[PDB]
Design a protein around this nucleic acid. Structure first.
Lengths: 114, 156, 66
RNA sequence: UGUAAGUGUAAAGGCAUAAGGUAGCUUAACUGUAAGACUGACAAGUCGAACAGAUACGAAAGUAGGUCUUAGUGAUCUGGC
RNA sequence: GGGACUGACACCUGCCCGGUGCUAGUAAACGGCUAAGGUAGCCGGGUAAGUUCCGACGAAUGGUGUAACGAUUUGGACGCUGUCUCAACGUGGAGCUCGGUGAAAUUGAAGUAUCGGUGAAGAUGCCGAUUACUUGUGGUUAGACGGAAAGACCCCGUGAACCUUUACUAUAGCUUGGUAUUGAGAUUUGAUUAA
RNA sequence: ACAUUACCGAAGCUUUGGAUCUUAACGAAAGUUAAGAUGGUAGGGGAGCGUUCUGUAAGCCAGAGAAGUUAAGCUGGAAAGUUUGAUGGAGGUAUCAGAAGUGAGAAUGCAGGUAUGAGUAACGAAAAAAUGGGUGAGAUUCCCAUUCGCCGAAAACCUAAGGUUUCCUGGGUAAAGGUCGUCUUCCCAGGGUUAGUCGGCCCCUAAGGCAAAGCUGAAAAGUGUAGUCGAUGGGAAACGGGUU
RNA sequence: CUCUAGUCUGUUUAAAAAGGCAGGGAUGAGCUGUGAAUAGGAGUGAAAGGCUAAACAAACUCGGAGAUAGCUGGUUCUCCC
RNA sequence: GUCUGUAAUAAGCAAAAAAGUUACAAAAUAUUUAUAUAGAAGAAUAAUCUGGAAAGUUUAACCAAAGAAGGUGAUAGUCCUGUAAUUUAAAUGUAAAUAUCUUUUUAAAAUGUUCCUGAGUAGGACGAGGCACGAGAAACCUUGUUUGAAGCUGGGGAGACCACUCUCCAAGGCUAAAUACUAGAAAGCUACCGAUAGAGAAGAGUACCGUGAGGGAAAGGUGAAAAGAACCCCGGGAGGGGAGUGAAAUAGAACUGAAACCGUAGACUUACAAGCAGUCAAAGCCGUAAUUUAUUGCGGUGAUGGCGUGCCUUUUGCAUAAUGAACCUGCGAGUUAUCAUGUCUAGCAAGAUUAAAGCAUAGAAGUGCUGGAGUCGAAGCGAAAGCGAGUCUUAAAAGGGCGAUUU
RNA sequence: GGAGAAGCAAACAUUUAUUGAUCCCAAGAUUACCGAAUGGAGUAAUCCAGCUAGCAAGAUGCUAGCUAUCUAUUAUUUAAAUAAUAGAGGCGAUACCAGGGGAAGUGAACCAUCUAAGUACCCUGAGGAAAAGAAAUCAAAGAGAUUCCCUUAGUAGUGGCGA
């Protein structure tokens, strides 16, 4: 009834070290620094998983605005006409379209300007 | 208080630059005492007799429910006291390759000291039953003397 | 038996238990100067009372057996 | 003119039906009690119709369980009558 | 012989017995100066320029002088000088390089720039802006509210210890009375009880 | 500043996929649907993982490779869990149930190992070393020789107080010597201290201690006479030279 | 031969109280060797709250003792409401 | 029975009972397969496969009053030593029993007169302590200082005291067992420990520290067997490289050998840049699998972009320049015993339940009975007497307080 | 008890053991010096004797055997003095028991009563148990020595009626 067998702490540490492989300096091997950096990293991972949506939508908007710089339609007005003519296509889709097949996007814009 | 050593303060309270300490056998220190460790204690207790009796009835019913594992043999005795004879009798009856519990209606010292050495055998008199042995016995062999004595033993 | 909980004697001598929980006690202020106190006040102080339900748990701790 | 006067004692709230003032009688400045409440952590404190006995005053109905109300006070333990 | 007090020597050492000690008295007792109100005594010069210095409280817990003495304190003069204006040079041990041996305290890490602001209110880590090739060595500490010492000062804890007292409560010791140790005589000082 | 149409913009809202819980309905029940409700310290309630031992277990799995770190991959909503290899060469353990020395990231924690400062400060007094030769695998530091320097009312010599083989011969360099080392007060082996005249012992006493008896105190003892011990003291005897 | 004013080095020093310069005593209240006596609410103190085995406003060791702290610090796996 | 001789009684002798555990003391042997202290006997395996090694795999037995525990080259009932049930005592030690021996009664049932029946003692006064009881009404006992009795026609006690009554007979001295304890000895056990654990100590109060009293560590493991590496090469050696032993020599003074720490080699990135060092995107390079093959994934590196004030503790509030940690690995804190109360589970039920302890079997610190003394409910109210589904406050159920008739 | 043995581990070369070794047990012998240490003394392991016996005993020779003290009992005028035997000295049990001495840290959120507590510890005694033990008792019940348990019971009382 002594209950000592220390095959537990090494296990925790091995899992942590496995997840903290590529970190700089002593953060990849020492238990204390690895645990501190990992725990703040996972919280960053959660926050950033929610932020990636904002980041990508912002990118899509900027790409659309760039593809419209040619014509005389400010893309606020472009979204305007898009909704008003009842075209429910997506920001990601339009952004990708302006790169893959520019003439289809241009035709959409001609159609919006009505 | 029971580890050998003196109760002198190892060094002064203030000024040394070390963590404060009262005695060398501090439970924190290596080799020191042990805080909230085990001490001798009485683990025995006595259950209500009615509950104990009900448990006996229940385990006996649970064992007898199965036709094959529970068996009854006509009264016999090993008058020679040898072990060959008893072992032959078990190995004729028992089938589930494991614990075998024989029930007796008396204190037949010859059978008991003939069976004290069998591999997985437990000999029990009717009036000295043990619930653990009954519950874990995979073969249960009773004499009809034991059956009758159990009947008036637990009907009361 | 090595460690039977001791009753608080000074509390035993002042508290009493009713059958279903309430605590009976003797009111104070009827032990001393009494000429000035009004007669109806004294008459009410004579009759015994029951404690508020807020002290009953502590009292039950103080009187572990009674 | 209509309470600014005066209400033992501080001030406030009240007091014309005067709770102000005077006179006669008188001791309820009682006993056993109490429905129902306010205030309140508790311990405490306060109001109280009404009931029984004994009265006081008044013809009687009724009032009176001190002071117009709101401060004048001290638990428990111990001791004395 | 013991204790207290003063402190070579010289001139002096006064007043007060209420209070508190000691056995009405005692102050060369504690102390004071209504019990008694303190007796004796205790601007000039120096420098061009001097808050320093020199010359014009209190009487046996002592007052005022004093030759000699002092690793004592303070002022001034003479001589002498790197103390200073004012530093430079030289010498010796370290420091510098190499070879051998080889620490310490500190240490959450660090691909740690600055300025203007904000903020647990003095920013290496934030915002804006600016600067900056990478990495060492020899110097100097401006910062990292540097390291070292659970701040020594302040305050708190119904903390601890010591000391003092006309704080409280015990008590050594001292002292008084009674009694046991402890008997026999003589005498009148009485009280009480009756005659 | 006043007008018209907008857009961007949060973990809000809407939609998609999945999970738990409360309520309601359906269903024999299990559950299936509808509604909403789930930030959270103190603190309350509830549900699990994992470790060791015990019964299950004289069971099962292991030398054809147990336990343990160890590389990679995979599963579970979290605690985590188990497959293949390397290493390892001898015991672990399913299910159910019970019992705790039952889970560490810190207490200026304890113990051990190793970084950091850092090849940096020092390497211990400003009495000073230099050349040649010998020994040795190896010489600025050992030995020998010739110069120089230092102490010289000592840094010299002879005896105490103390140390206790540190002394001599021979051999050797793990460590230790603040470096090196053939050397050492280092290590190993062997050897070495001869008393009538020295110092003690001894016969005497100073201070002091013990102390029959006596006396005084709960005990244990405290005082203290006769005595007996107690040297740095007082008392018989030796000097020179040589030898290892 | 015994002492330490003044100054300096030193102060993660060679030394847990020295050394480098200097000064006082130096025939006496002298220095010192070798023995012995005084022990903790006590001793000793040419008198500074000093010393008594490098630390003394009550030595050290052991035991009571794991003393008591309204003070500080620490208190280890997970999920749901 | 002052001397002799008689009615009439003592001192010795037949006859019996006890005694070294109190009761009188001192022993000594025989005798007890009783015991303590050396011992003896002691059951029942062959083949096959893997492997250095079998006890194991597998196929078949045998023994068992012995399948308790160890060792045996990997895991043994049958290999060895032991184990069950039996059993060695010349000598020595400890126990009873029997006689011997020692001692005692060598007698009792029986009425009233006298003697004694425990003396500075019982008690009282004052000052203290022990009794659960602190002067409180304070008994009683011991006891220091003082005082001081009765003599069975008696005295002590019955919680101040008095009376009656009921008990007991002090001031002399012994007494085994039940009970406390284990430094230790032998035989055994463990939901006790396995080298920072366990006694401080697997090597010991040693090394070391202090004048002394005293304080006090750290250090276990080759291999199945040294079978300790002949010989050869480098080197002064050490050590290493070969050759051999061994299943293994990254088993060679040591098993499994991690983390912290120090390295080597290969791949990628980096010397115009202000990064709590991470996350979310992402070109290029390298490794790799598919898709007929250079575009998608598993990967390792990562230019560049966006976001981001380490952690713990403490505070109204901290990145704070408040506190704490050099790193890493071990060790390192709500436990146990009882009582109260609440809940859950199990059982019985107006009842529930035994504690100590005993017996039986076993040797198996069990568990089956025996054991009801005691406790909690079943009636409460009132200070109590006492009364009772009522009780108390009061002349009053007259109103309430505490109850209940619906446990 | 039977074939090895020369300790706790072997090594290196020497013997013993079947003539019964080694070893285990029982008994006996030997049993230096210090130590209760006891002839005196003393810095414990050592110097100084008195007497007797043997060493050629002898000039500080060696060896063996006696002379310490307290208490009880008598050989005497038990005090003094020796003589005679008998019982003790000290250690062990960092256990237990009896007698004597007797705190302090705490709690009472202080403290002075009280508590802790007859606790620790000191000292004097023996035993294997000790102490106590055969009613001038318990106590209002009819019991009958002493001691140790289960209950009575946290009850009866006590307590700056505070803890």
């Amino acid at each position: 009834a002594r209950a000592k067998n220390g095959t537990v702490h090494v296990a925790r540490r091995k899992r942590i070290l496995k997840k903290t492989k590529g970190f700089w300096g002593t953060k990849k091997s020492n238990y204390k620094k690895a645990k501190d950096t990992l725990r703040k990293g996972m919280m960053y991972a959660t926050r950033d998983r929610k932020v990636r949506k904002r980041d990508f939508r912002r990118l899509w908007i900027s790409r659309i605005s760039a593809a419209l710089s040619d014509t005389g339609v400010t893309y606020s007005r472009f979204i305007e006409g898009l909704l008003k003519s009842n075209i429910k296509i997506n920001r990601k889709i339009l952004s990708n379209l302006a790169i893959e097949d520019v003439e289809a996007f241009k035709k959409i814009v001609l159609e919006i300007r009505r | 208080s029971e580890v050998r050593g003196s109760s002198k303060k190892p060094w002064k309270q203030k000024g040394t630059g070390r963590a404060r300490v009262g005695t060398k056998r501090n439970p924190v220190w290596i080799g020191g005492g042990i805080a909230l460790g085990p001490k001798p204690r009485d683990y025995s207790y006595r259950l209500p007799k009615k509950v104990k009796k009900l448990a006996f009835k229940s385990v006996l019913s649970l064992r007898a429910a199965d036709e094959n594992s529970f068996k009854v043999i006509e009264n016999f005795n090993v008058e020679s006291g040898k072990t060959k004879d008893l072992a032959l009798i078990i190995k004729n009856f028992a089938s589930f390759n494991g614990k075998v519990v024989i029930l007796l209606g008396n204190d037949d010292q010859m059978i008991k000291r003939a069976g004290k050495n069998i591999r997985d055998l437990k000999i029990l008199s009717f009036d000295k039953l043990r619930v653990v042995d009954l519950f874990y016995a995979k073969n249960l062999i009773a004499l009809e003397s034991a059956v009758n004595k159990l009947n008036e033993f637990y009907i009361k | 038996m090595a460690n039977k909980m001791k009753t608080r004697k000074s509390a035993k001598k002042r508290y009493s238990f009713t059958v279903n929980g309430k605590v009976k006690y003797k009111k104070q202020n009827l032990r001393h100067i009494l000429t000035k106190k009004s007669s109806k006040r004294k008459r009410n102080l004579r009759k015994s009372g029951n404690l508020s339900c807020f002290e009953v748990k502590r009292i039950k701790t103080l009187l572990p057996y009674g």
